[PDB]
PDB file of C-alpha atoms in Angstrom:
ATOM      1  CA  UNK A   1      11.544  65.576  12.702  1.00  0.00           C
ATOM      2  CA  UNK A   2      11.489  68.286  10.038  1.00  0.00           C
ATOM      3  CA  UNK A   3      11.811  65.789   7.186  1.00  0.00           C
ATOM      4  CA  UNK A   4       9.125  63.546   8.675  1.00  0.00           C
ATOM      5  CA  UNK A   5       6.741  66.484   8.993  1.00  0.00           C
ATOM      6  CA  UNK A   6       7.477  67.408   5.371  1.00  0.00           C
ATOM      7  CA  UNK A   7       6.842  63.832   4.215  1.00  0.00           C
ATOM      8  CA  UNK A   8       3.460  63.606   5.943  1.00  0.00           C
ATOM      9  CA  UNK A   9       2.451  66.994   4.537  1.00  0.00           C
ATOM     10  CA  UNK A  10       3.289  65.821   1.005  1.00  0.00           C
ATOM     11  CA  UNK A  11       1.276  62.633   1.499  1.00  0.00           C
ATOM     12  CA  UNK A  12      -1.784  64.472   2.840  1.00  0.00           C
ATOM     13  CA  UNK A  13      -1.704  67.577   0.631  1.00  0.00           C
ATOM     14  CA  UNK A  14       0.137  66.404  -2.473  1.00  0.00           C
ATOM     15  CA  UNK A  15       0.530  63.107  -4.303  1.00  0.00           C
ATOM     16  CA  UNK A  16       2.923  60.454  -3.013  1.00  0.00           C
ATOM     17  CA  UNK A  17       3.400  56.945  -4.399  1.00  0.00           C
ATOM     18  CA  UNK A  18       4.094  54.432  -1.622  1.00  0.00           C
ATOM     19  CA  UNK A  19       6.125  51.249  -1.957  1.00  0.00           C
ATOM     20  CA  UNK A  20       9.445  50.152  -3.414  1.00  0.00           C
ATOM     21  CA  UNK A  21       7.921  48.307  -6.385  1.00  0.00           C
ATOM     22  CA  UNK A  22       5.646  51.221  -7.303  1.00  0.00           C
ATOM     23  CA  UNK A  23       8.403  53.789  -6.770  1.00  0.00           C
ATOM     24  CA  UNK A  24      10.750  51.942  -9.124  1.00  0.00           C
ATOM     25  CA  UNK A  25       7.987  51.580 -11.710  1.00  0.00           C
ATOM     26  CA  UNK A  26       7.214  55.294 -11.728  1.00  0.00           C
ATOM     27  CA  UNK A  27      10.871  56.340 -11.763  1.00  0.00           C
ATOM     28  CA  UNK A  28      11.585  53.879 -14.582  1.00  0.00           C
ATOM     29  CA  UNK A  29       8.935  55.722 -16.596  1.00  0.00           C
ATOM     30  CA  UNK A  30      10.614  59.027 -15.750  1.00  0.00           C
ATOM     31  CA  UNK A  31       7.904  60.281 -13.386  1.00  0.00           C
ATOM     32  CA  UNK A  32       8.520  61.834  -9.977  1.00  0.00           C
ATOM     33  CA  UNK A  33      10.160  64.740  -8.175  1.00  0.00           C
ATOM     34  CA  UNK A  34      11.826  63.088  -5.189  1.00  0.00           C
ATOM     35  CA  UNK A  35      12.564  59.619  -3.860  1.00  0.00           C
ATOM     36  CA  UNK A  36      12.778  58.869  -0.130  1.00  0.00           C
ATOM     37  CA  UNK A  37      14.223  55.525   0.995  1.00  0.00           C
ATOM     38  CA  UNK A  38      13.822  53.801   4.368  1.00  0.00           C
ATOM     39  CA  UNK A  39      16.981  52.788   6.239  1.00  0.00           C
ATOM     40  CA  UNK A  40      16.278  49.053   5.977  1.00  0.00           C
ATOM     41  CA  UNK A  41      15.406  48.958   2.292  1.00  0.00           C
ATOM     42  CA  UNK A  42      16.835  45.849   0.568  1.00  0.00           C
ATOM     43  CA  UNK A  43      20.164  46.740  -1.040  1.00  0.00           C
ATOM     44  CA  UNK A  44      19.138  45.527  -4.491  1.00  0.00           C
ATOM     45  CA  UNK A  45      15.982  47.657  -4.509  1.00  0.00           C
ATOM     46  CA  UNK A  46      18.047  50.606  -3.240  1.00  0.00           C
ATOM     47  CA  UNK A  47      20.450  50.254  -6.159  1.00  0.00           C
ATOM     48  CA  UNK A  48      17.649  49.803  -8.673  1.00  0.00           C
ATOM     49  CA  UNK A  49      15.822  52.948  -7.592  1.00  0.00           C
ATOM     50  CA  UNK A  50      19.015  55.013  -7.476  1.00  0.00           C
ATOM     51  CA  UNK A  51      19.936  53.853 -10.977  1.00  0.00           C
ATOM     52  CA  UNK A  52      16.594  54.795 -12.537  1.00  0.00           C
ATOM     53  CA  UNK A  53      16.282  58.006 -10.500  1.00  0.00           C
ATOM     54  CA  UNK A  54      19.722  59.036 -11.753  1.00  0.00           C
ATOM     55  CA  UNK A  55      18.640  58.407 -15.362  1.00  0.00           C
ATOM     56  CA  UNK A  56      15.762  60.888 -15.071  1.00  0.00           C
ATOM     57  CA  UNK A  57      17.675  63.229 -12.759  1.00  0.00           C
ATOM     58  CA  UNK A  58      15.328  62.627  -9.830  1.00  0.00           C
ATOM     59  CA  UNK A  59      16.927  63.288  -6.424  1.00  0.00           C
ATOM     60  CA  UNK A  60      17.004  60.504  -3.839  1.00  0.00           C
ATOM     61  CA  UNK A  61      16.939  61.131  -0.098  1.00  0.00           C
ATOM     62  CA  UNK A  62      18.198  58.258   2.049  1.00  0.00           C
ATOM     63  CA  UNK A  63      16.333  58.307   5.351  1.00  0.00           C
ATOM     64  CA  UNK A  64      17.525  56.559   8.511  1.00  0.00           C
ATOM     65  CA  UNK A  65      14.166  55.415   9.871  1.00  0.00           C
ATOM     66  CA  UNK A  66      12.857  51.893   9.198  1.00  0.00           C
ATOM     67  CA  UNK A  67      10.252  50.977   6.590  1.00  0.00           C
ATOM     68  CA  UNK A  68       7.608  50.470   9.301  1.00  0.00           C
ATOM     69  CA  UNK A  69       8.559  53.845  10.795  1.00  0.00           C
ATOM     70  CA  UNK A  70       8.332  55.523   7.374  1.00  0.00           C
ATOM     71  CA  UNK A  71       4.941  53.944   6.845  1.00  0.00           C
ATOM     72  CA  UNK A  72       3.807  55.463  10.148  1.00  0.00           C
ATOM     73  CA  UNK A  73       5.195  58.867   9.129  1.00  0.00           C
ATOM     74  CA  UNK A  74       2.984  58.615   6.037  1.00  0.00           C
ATOM     75  CA  UNK A  75       0.084  57.796   8.339  1.00  0.00           C
ATOM     76  CA  UNK A  76      -0.020  54.133   7.332  1.00  0.00           C
ATOM     77  CA  UNK A  77      -0.051  50.932   9.436  1.00  0.00           C
ATOM     78  CA  UNK A  78       2.029  49.108   6.812  1.00  0.00           C
ATOM     79  CA  UNK A  79       5.764  49.292   5.910  1.00  0.00           C
ATOM     80  CA  UNK A  80       6.983  51.653   3.176  1.00  0.00           C
ATOM     81  CA  UNK A  81      10.562  50.926   2.075  1.00  0.00           C
ATOM     82  CA  UNK A  82      10.476  53.683  -0.544  1.00  0.00           C
ATOM     83  CA  UNK A  83       8.129  56.445  -1.649  1.00  0.00           C
ATOM     84  CA  UNK A  84       7.993  58.851  -4.565  1.00  0.00           C
ATOM     85  CA  UNK A  85       6.750  62.427  -4.398  1.00  0.00           C
ATOM     86  CA  UNK A  86       4.814  63.132  -7.593  1.00  0.00           C
ATOM     87  CA  UNK A  87       3.491  66.407  -6.179  1.00  0.00           C
ATOM     88  CA  UNK A  88       4.877  68.006  -3.007  1.00  0.00           C
ATOM     89  CA  UNK A  89       1.570  69.749  -2.342  1.00  0.00           C
ATOM     90  CA  UNK A  90       2.045  72.266   0.481  1.00  0.00           C
ATOM     91  CA  UNK A  91       5.196  70.506   1.703  1.00  0.00           C
ATOM     92  CA  UNK A  92       8.683  72.008   1.744  1.00  0.00           C
ATOM     93  CA  UNK A  93      10.219  68.541   1.444  1.00  0.00           C
ATOM     94  CA  UNK A  94      11.991  69.500  -1.789  1.00  0.00           C
ATOM     95  CA  UNK A  95      13.758  72.395  -0.082  1.00  0.00           C
ATOM     96  CA  UNK A  96      14.558  70.434   3.082  1.00  0.00           C
ATOM     97  CA  UNK A  97      16.206  67.684   1.048  1.00  0.00           C
ATOM     98  CA  UNK A  98      18.198  70.195  -1.042  1.00  0.00           C
ATOM     99  CA  UNK A  99      20.240  71.159   2.003  1.00  0.00           C
ATOM    100  CA  UNK A 100      20.193  67.700   3.567  1.00  0.00           C
ATOM    101  CA  UNK A 101      22.939  67.503   6.232  1.00  0.00           C
TER     102      UNK A 101
ATOM    103  CA  UNK B   1      29.748  29.622 -10.034  1.00  0.00           C
ATOM    104  CA  UNK B   2      33.114  29.195  -8.322  1.00  0.00           C
ATOM    105  CA  UNK B   3      32.153  31.405  -5.377  1.00  0.00           C
ATOM    106  CA  UNK B   4      28.956  29.434  -4.795  1.00  0.00           C
ATOM    107  CA  UNK B   5      30.838  26.132  -4.965  1.00  0.00           C
ATOM    108  CA  UNK B   6      33.356  27.528  -2.480  1.00  0.00           C
ATOM    109  CA  UNK B   7      30.606  28.673  -0.108  1.00  0.00           C
ATOM    110  CA  UNK B   8      28.900  25.284  -0.080  1.00  0.00           C
ATOM    111  CA  UNK B   9      32.258  23.585   0.516  1.00  0.00           C
ATOM    112  CA  UNK B  10      32.912  25.811   3.541  1.00  0.00           C
ATOM    113  CA  UNK B  11      29.463  25.090   4.969  1.00  0.00           C
ATOM    114  CA  UNK B  12      29.883  21.326   4.507  1.00  0.00           C
ATOM    115  CA  UNK B  13      33.560  20.873   5.384  1.00  0.00           C
ATOM    116  CA  UNK B  14      34.181  23.828   7.682  1.00  0.00           C
ATOM    117  CA  UNK B  15      32.170  26.023  10.023  1.00  0.00           C
ATOM    118  CA  UNK B  16      29.854  28.737   8.718  1.00  0.00           C
ATOM    119  CA  UNK B  17      27.468  30.854  10.788  1.00  0.00           C
ATOM    120  CA  UNK B  18      24.219  31.501   8.903  1.00  0.00           C
ATOM    121  CA  UNK B  19      22.038  34.570   9.354  1.00  0.00           C
ATOM    122  CA  UNK B  20      22.405  38.344   9.443  1.00  0.00           C
ATOM    123  CA  UNK B  21      21.751  38.633  13.187  1.00  0.00           C
ATOM    124  CA  UNK B  22      24.181  35.858  14.112  1.00  0.00           C
ATOM    125  CA  UNK B  23      26.814  37.127  11.670  1.00  0.00           C
ATOM    126  CA  UNK B  24      26.703  40.590  13.229  1.00  0.00           C
ATOM    127  CA  UNK B  25      26.836  39.091  16.722  1.00  0.00           C
ATOM    128  CA  UNK B  26      29.931  37.038  15.920  1.00  0.00           C
ATOM    129  CA  UNK B  27      31.720  39.837  14.070  1.00  0.00           C
ATOM    130  CA  UNK B  28      30.853  42.276  16.847  1.00  0.00           C
ATOM    131  CA  UNK B  29      32.779  39.899  19.148  1.00  0.00           C
ATOM    132  CA  UNK B  30      35.732  39.863  16.772  1.00  0.00           C
ATOM    133  CA  UNK B  31      35.208  36.304  15.491  1.00  0.00           C
ATOM    134  CA  UNK B  32      35.242  35.187  11.857  1.00  0.00           C
ATOM    135  CA  UNK B  33      37.388  35.057   8.731  1.00  0.00           C
ATOM    136  CA  UNK B  34      35.057  36.212   5.970  1.00  0.00           C
ATOM    137  CA  UNK B  35      31.610  37.730   5.614  1.00  0.00           C
ATOM    138  CA  UNK B  36      29.392  37.056   2.602  1.00  0.00           C
ATOM    139  CA  UNK B  37      26.300  39.210   2.044  1.00  0.00           C
ATOM    140  CA  UNK B  38      23.283  38.452  -0.156  1.00  0.00           C
ATOM    141  CA  UNK B  39      22.241  41.015  -2.774  1.00  0.00           C
ATOM    142  CA  UNK B  40      18.938  41.890  -1.103  1.00  0.00           C
ATOM    143  CA  UNK B  41      20.233  42.280   2.436  1.00  0.00           C
ATOM    144  CA  UNK B  42      18.576  45.224   4.248  1.00  0.00           C
ATOM    145  CA  UNK B  43      20.761  48.324   3.964  1.00  0.00           C
ATOM    146  CA  UNK B  44      20.991  48.921   7.706  1.00  0.00           C
ATOM    147  CA  UNK B  45      22.130  45.352   8.383  1.00  0.00           C
ATOM    148  CA  UNK B  46      24.622  45.673   5.514  1.00  0.00           C
ATOM    149  CA  UNK B  47      26.102  48.808   7.068  1.00  0.00           C
ATOM    150  CA  UNK B  48      26.198  47.286  10.544  1.00  0.00           C
ATOM    151  CA  UNK B  49      28.022  44.206   9.253  1.00  0.00           C
ATOM    152  CA  UNK B  50      30.576  46.257   7.317  1.00  0.00           C
ATOM    153  CA  UNK B  51      31.165  48.516  10.312  1.00  0.00           C
ATOM    154  CA  UNK B  52      31.930  45.722  12.775  1.00  0.00           C
ATOM    155  CA  UNK B  53      33.789  43.638  10.183  1.00  0.00           C
ATOM    156  CA  UNK B  54      36.013  46.645   9.509  1.00  0.00           C
ATOM    157  CA  UNK B  55      36.760  46.970  13.232  1.00  0.00           C
ATOM    158  CA  UNK B  56      38.200  43.428  13.406  1.00  0.00           C
ATOM    159  CA  UNK B  57      39.742  43.534   9.904  1.00  0.00           C
ATOM    160  CA  UNK B  58      37.375  40.861   8.574  1.00  0.00           C
ATOM    161  CA  UNK B  59      36.877  40.960   4.787  1.00  0.00           C
ATOM    162  CA  UNK B  60      33.345  41.300   3.417  1.00  0.00           C
ATOM    163  CA  UNK B  61      32.293  39.879   0.054  1.00  0.00           C
ATOM    164  CA  UNK B  62      29.122  41.389  -1.419  1.00  0.00           C
ATOM    165  CA  UNK B  63      27.321  38.727  -3.425  1.00  0.00           C
ATOM    166  CA  UNK B  64      24.719  39.429  -6.100  1.00  0.00           C
ATOM    167  CA  UNK B  65      22.393  36.507  -5.463  1.00  0.00           C
ATOM    168  CA  UNK B  66      19.318  36.873  -3.247  1.00  0.00           C
ATOM    169  CA  UNK B  67      19.005  35.697   0.361  1.00  0.00           C
ATOM    170  CA  UNK B  68      16.853  32.733  -0.678  1.00  0.00           C
ATOM    171  CA  UNK B  69      19.396  31.882  -3.382  1.00  0.00           C
ATOM    172  CA  UNK B  70      22.286  32.112  -0.909  1.00  0.00           C
ATOM    173  CA  UNK B  71      20.394  29.859   1.471  1.00  0.00           C
ATOM    174  CA  UNK B  72      20.069  27.280  -1.312  1.00  0.00           C
ATOM    175  CA  UNK B  73      23.787  27.580  -2.075  1.00  0.00           C
ATOM    176  CA  UNK B  74      24.337  26.670   1.584  1.00  0.00           C
ATOM    177  CA  UNK B  75      22.063  23.668   1.137  1.00  0.00           C
ATOM    178  CA  UNK B  76      19.249  25.250   3.138  1.00  0.00           C
ATOM    179  CA  UNK B  77      15.553  25.776   2.285  1.00  0.00           C
ATOM    180  CA  UNK B  78      15.512  29.072   4.192  1.00  0.00           C
ATOM    181  CA  UNK B  79      16.861  32.575   3.325  1.00  0.00           C
ATOM    182  CA  UNK B  80      20.361  33.612   4.425  1.00  0.00           C
ATOM    183  CA  UNK B  81      21.001  37.361   4.059  1.00  0.00           C
ATOM    184  CA  UNK B  82      24.504  37.080   5.494  1.00  0.00           C
ATOM    185  CA  UNK B  83      26.870  34.333   6.587  1.00  0.00           C
ATOM    186  CA  UNK B  84      30.181  34.217   8.427  1.00  0.00           C
ATOM    187  CA  UNK B  85      32.993  31.780   7.697  1.00  0.00           C
ATOM    188  CA  UNK B  86      34.500  30.729  11.032  1.00  0.00           C
ATOM    189  CA  UNK B  87      36.575  27.998   9.388  1.00  0.00           C
ATOM    190  CA  UNK B  88      36.937  27.625   5.607  1.00  0.00           C
ATOM    191  CA  UNK B  89      37.367  23.864   5.900  1.00  0.00           C
ATOM    192  CA  UNK B  90      38.523  22.503   2.532  1.00  0.00           C
ATOM    193  CA  UNK B  91      37.127  25.503   0.639  1.00  0.00           C
ATOM    194  CA  UNK B  92      39.210  27.998  -1.334  1.00  0.00           C
ATOM    195  CA  UNK B  93      36.637  30.716  -0.645  1.00  0.00           C
ATOM    196  CA  UNK B  94      39.272  32.927   1.016  1.00  0.00           C
ATOM    197  CA  UNK B  95      41.432  32.816  -2.106  1.00  0.00           C
ATOM    198  CA  UNK B  96      38.521  33.411  -4.475  1.00  0.00           C
ATOM    199  CA  UNK B  97      37.394  36.454  -2.513  1.00  0.00           C
ATOM    200  CA  UNK B  98      40.916  37.903  -2.586  1.00  0.00           C
ATOM    201  CA  UNK B  99      39.730  37.925  -6.209  1.00  0.00           C
TER     202      UNK B  99
END
């Protein structure tokens, strides 16, 4: 609930890249502050994003909700298997993730 | 190479359940000898399979090829994200997996 609120806030007040393909592309280029993955993200994409994120020291938060659920959290009617926060805006998502438990 | 040949042999000469949903169903009921997962299997399904497989001591081999590729290895035109060997038939898949 807290994380989902933080994600929506980042999307509406900051800058968030939506989609697994786009997320990987941005992270590969070293851009981004935080990666959030849906619980049903394809394993290969999951490993790709974690590999590139690791290379640029970008944290990755593994969510439990589905890609369609994550899309809805972002206020979208389409699935989002992964997203990348470029700018957290007024969100506290960065801090929430830091003590993720 | 060898693994793919072994998988096709099991499908053709033995009994293999195709599909992530069916695989989980069978393993959840304690049936099966070996699970093979495609490289792009959804993470949640992957975790579910490994959880139930673990409960009935059923080995799980994580493949690198995609679901559509695995389907083709099985001689099918459709994607197969996971499969369950009920009977290896004439295949040596069990031995190969032991690695």
